[PDB]
Amino acid sequence: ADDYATTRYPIVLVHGLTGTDKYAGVLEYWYGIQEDLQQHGATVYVANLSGFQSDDGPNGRGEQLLAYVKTVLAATGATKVNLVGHSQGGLTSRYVAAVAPDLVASVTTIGTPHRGSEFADFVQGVLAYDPTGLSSSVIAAFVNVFGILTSSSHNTNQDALASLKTLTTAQAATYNQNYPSAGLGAPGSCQTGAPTETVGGNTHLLYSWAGTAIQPTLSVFGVTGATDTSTIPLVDPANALDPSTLALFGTGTVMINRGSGQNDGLVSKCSALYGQVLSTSYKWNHIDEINQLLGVRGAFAEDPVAVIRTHANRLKLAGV
Ligand SMILES: [Ca+2]
């Protein structure tokens, strides 16, 4: 054990959609990652927010995270935190950095849909095809109940229709208008913005990375193929041991046919770009990014624990 990852300010890990600190109180969202960071000297706190909510709004994840951050500061005696968000958690982290900029030293986003998800667009379009709303009522109720039952604290504030809308491309574009950041490039550029921001006189270091396991191949009859570059084709252990591997290849194929380009199954490379983009080359699907399921990743996927650890060192060397 050592101080490789000892940052000045505590690290707050911020989960995305479906999440909680520990599913059913048994499976860490950030599997193995708090342990590894702490072994290397980081002070690490894991937020437990609604798995299904918007980021803004009085009932949203942003205000939940703000309240949590204030408790972390009081406990640690620190004046700021380093926010590290996966998936929607990067959007939640942006909210806190905008509304409480004096409490934040840095924002790092991992597979965050800054520009939304084409898969969310697909789901919302399908629900809109039923004019009765019954599909929305039934599916969202099931998802909400999943959220309640799997939340470590049985948090009953679960609104799957709000989270779905939040993660659409149209709504993300509105979010970016409402909560701008210098870390964002222009819409449609597929390029990042500035590596730092000063918000209300408070400087924030901005970082991101993305997984691009799912790559487009050939188009035949208007249908574009895809391949999962994380895996040995077909026979990779990850296809057998982690049900998300094949599922995210499928969702990523759908997204490619909606015009996403390369993606992690749920978030495109372009959507994920923010601040200083440290990599978009990891052969990762969306939950490989958080060392899931149970550390299982394709043979060609880099170790996400080591990537996060190295980033804590980067933060340390940057003075946060
Ligand atoms: Ca995996």
- How many angstroms does the Cα of residue 284 sit away from the middle of ligand 1? 8
- Residues labelled as active-site residues: 87, 264, 286
Nearest one of 299, 304, 213, 298 to 251, comparing CA atoms: 213
Distance CA 306, CA 242 (A): 20
Residue list, annotated binding site for Ca(2+): 242, 288, 292, 296
Tell me the angle at which helices 134-150 and 160-167 cross, rounded to the nearest 10 degrees.
Answer: 100
Six-digit token string for 192: 């990042």
Q: What is the 8-class DSSP label of residue 78?
A: -
Six-digit token string for 247: 């599922």
Distances 192 to 3, 174, 205, 250 between C-alpha atoms, Å: 31, 18, 14, 27
Residues 249 and 225: beta-carbon distance below 8 Å: no
The resolution, in angstroms to one decimal, equals 1.1
Distance CA 278, CA 294 (A): 25
- How many angstroms does the Cα of residue 270 sit away from the middle of ligand 1? 22
Full domain range(s) for residue 307: 1-320
SS3 content of the chain, % helix, strand, coil (to 5): 40, 20, 40
What phi and psi, each to the nearest 5 degrees, are found at residue 224?
Answer: -95, 130
For residue 122, count other CB atoms closer than 10 A to its CB. Answer: 16
Residues 284 and 304: beta-carbon distance below 8 Å: yes
Six-digit token string for 176: 């970016």
The residue behind tokens 């004046």 is: 79
How many domains, in total, are found in the chain? 1
Six-digit token string for 281: 């080359």
Provide the experimental method for this PDB entry.
X-ray
Dihedral-angle region of residue 289 (phi above 0 means left; psi in -120 to 50 means alpha; beta otherwise): alpha
Q: Cβ contacts of residue 174 below 8 Å, gap of 6+? A: none
Six-digit token string for 4: 């490789």
Q: Cβ contacts of residue 302 below 8 Å, gap of 6+? A: 282, 283, 284
- How many angstroms does the Cα of residue 141 sit away from the middle of ligand 1? 27
Distances 315 to 7, 91, 134, 166, 204 between C-alpha atoms, Å: 6, 20, 48, 29, 11
